[PDB]
Each structure stands twice: as C-alpha cells, then as structure tokens.
C-alpha cells in the first residue's frame with residue numbers, strides 16, 4: 001500500500017479525486033475507514 005497522512009481539511013473524496021481513483025476503490029483498501037471522522041495524522045492507503 002502507498003501511504004498518505006491525513007492533513008487539515010482533507011476528505012476521502014478529495015484524496016480519491018486527486019489521485020484519479022474511485023472512492024469505492026479507496027474504501028476497499030482502507031478497512032471500514034470512517035470518512036466522516038478522519039483525524040489529522042491518520043494514515044490511509046492510496047493504492
């Protein structure tokens with residue numbers, strides 16, 4: 001997994017859009033992530 005660290009204002013949609021990936025694919029790589037409750041410093045997979 002390529003990792004990314006959540007920063008202020010980030011959203012799962014915007015991370016996905018920036019990388020040209022679907023939000024559903026992103027979710028499939030992120031084990032039930034709570035996209036409405038992201039924490040600054042949280043680490044996600046972007047591939």
Ligand SMILES: [Zn+2]
Pocket residue numbers: 023024027
């Ligand atoms: Zn979803």
Ligand SMILES: [Zn+2]
Pocket residue numbers: 022025
């Ligand atoms: Zn896909």
Ligand SMILES: [Zn+2]
Pocket residue numbers: 034035036037
């Ligand atoms: Zn939530």
